[PDB]
Amino acid sequence: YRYTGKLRPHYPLMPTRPVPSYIQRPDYADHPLGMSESEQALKGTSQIKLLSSEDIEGMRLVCRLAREVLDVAAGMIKPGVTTEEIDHAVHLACIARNCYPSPLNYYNFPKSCCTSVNEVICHGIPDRRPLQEGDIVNVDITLYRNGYHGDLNETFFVGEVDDGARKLVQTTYECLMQAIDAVKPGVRYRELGNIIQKHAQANGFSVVRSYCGHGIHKLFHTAPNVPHYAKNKAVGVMKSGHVFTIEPMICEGGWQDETWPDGWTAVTRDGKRSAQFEHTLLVTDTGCEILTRRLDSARPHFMS
Ligand SMILES: CCCC(CCC)[C@H](N)P(=O)(O)O
Ligand SMILES: [Co+2]
Ligand SMILES: [Co+2]
C-alpha cells in the first residue's frame, strides 16, 4: 500500500478496552462483525423518523453528554499526546456518564472514537503516534444512552499551526454554521450541499463526496443521507421532529478519498489536509436545535 501522505499508522494498538456490563449496549456491540440488525432491517429506506417527545428528550440527553466527552478530549490536545491516549480518556468519560462509546465495534471499528490527523478525512483509528506541533486533529465522538446515539466532532490545532491550517479549519467551521443556519421545515436536504460547496469553493477548497451527514437517533446511521457537495440528489424535505447530522469534510487539495488497508482510515488521495466539524440537529417548528452545541462557550475550541 502506498500512503498518500506523511502519516502512517503506529501499531500495535492496546488491547480492546472493555465496557462494564452495566452499560447498556447497542445491538452491534456483540455482533461478531459489528453489524447492526436494526440498521440492516432498515437499510435502503428513505423514510425519516418523526421523533416523539420522549425521543427528543433521549436525544437531548445523549447529545449533551456527547458534548461533555468531546470537551474532555479537546482539553487534552497538545504536542506529545497520542491519539490512543485521547481515546482512552474518551472511553473512560463515556463510561463515567453511563454511556456506551458508539464507535466501539461498530462494523468492527476497534476504538471508542475517531481521531483524524492532517490528511485523514475521517474515521482515523486512535494509535500510538504522538501529536506533533503544527498538526490538525479532529476528534469524532458518539455516545449511546438509553437506546439513543448522539454524534459530534471538531477539528483542533496542535500548538502553532500554519496560515493554511487556520484558513482550512475556519472555512470548514463556517461551512458548517452556514448549513445549520439554513435548517428549518420545508428545506430540502439536498440544498445543504449547495451552501457548503459555495463557501468552500470561494475559499479555494474542495468538498469530500464519499461521506455524508445522516439521520441519527435509535440508529447510529439512517435516513436521511445528507451530502455536503453542490447538486446532489439527496431525498427528502425537512420537517419538525427530524434529527440528523451535518458534517462537512473540506480539503486543501482535491476532493478524492481513499481508504487505508485497515478498512476505516479515509485519506485525501493527494495527501493534503482535510478538516471537519459535525453537529446533531433537531428540526423544530421554526428552525433547528443544535443538540450537540457547546454550552459553556459560544465558540468551538479551535477559536479559544
Ligand atoms: C466508527 C464510526 C464512527 C463514524 C461513523 C461510521 C460509519 C462517525 N461518528 P460519522 O457518522 O462519520 O460522523
Ligand atoms: Co461523527
Ligand atoms: Co456522524
The DSSP code sequence of 247-294 is: --EEESS---EEE-TTS--EEETT---EEE-BEEEEE-SSSEEETT--
Which technique?
X-ray
Instruction: Please state, as a whole number, how many other Cβ atoms lie within 10 Å of the Cβ of residue 243.
Output: 26
Q: Is the CB of 36 under 6 A from ligand 1?
A: no
Q: Is the CB of 173 under 6 A from ligand 1?
A: no
Contact 254, 268 (CB under 8 A): yes
Contact 126, 83 (CB under 8 A): yes
How many domains are there within the chain?
A: 1
Give the whole-angstrom CA distance, residue 138 versus residue 153: 7
Distance 283 CA to ligand 2 centre (A): 18
Resolution for this experimental structure (Å)? 1.9
Q: What is the CATH number of the domain that holds 122?
A: 3.90.230.10
Instruction: Please state, as a whole number, how many other Cβ atoms lie within 10 Å of the Cβ of residue 3.
Output: 12
Give the whole-angstrom CA distance, residue 157 versus residue 148: 30
Distance 190 CA to ligand 1 centre (A): 20
Parent domain of 200? 1-304
Residue with cell 488491547: 15
Contacting residues for 54 by C-beta, under 8 A, at least 6 apart: none
Q: Is the CB of 112 under 6 A from ligand 1?
A: no
To the nearest 10°, the Cα dihedral for 124, 192, 237, 235? Answer: -60
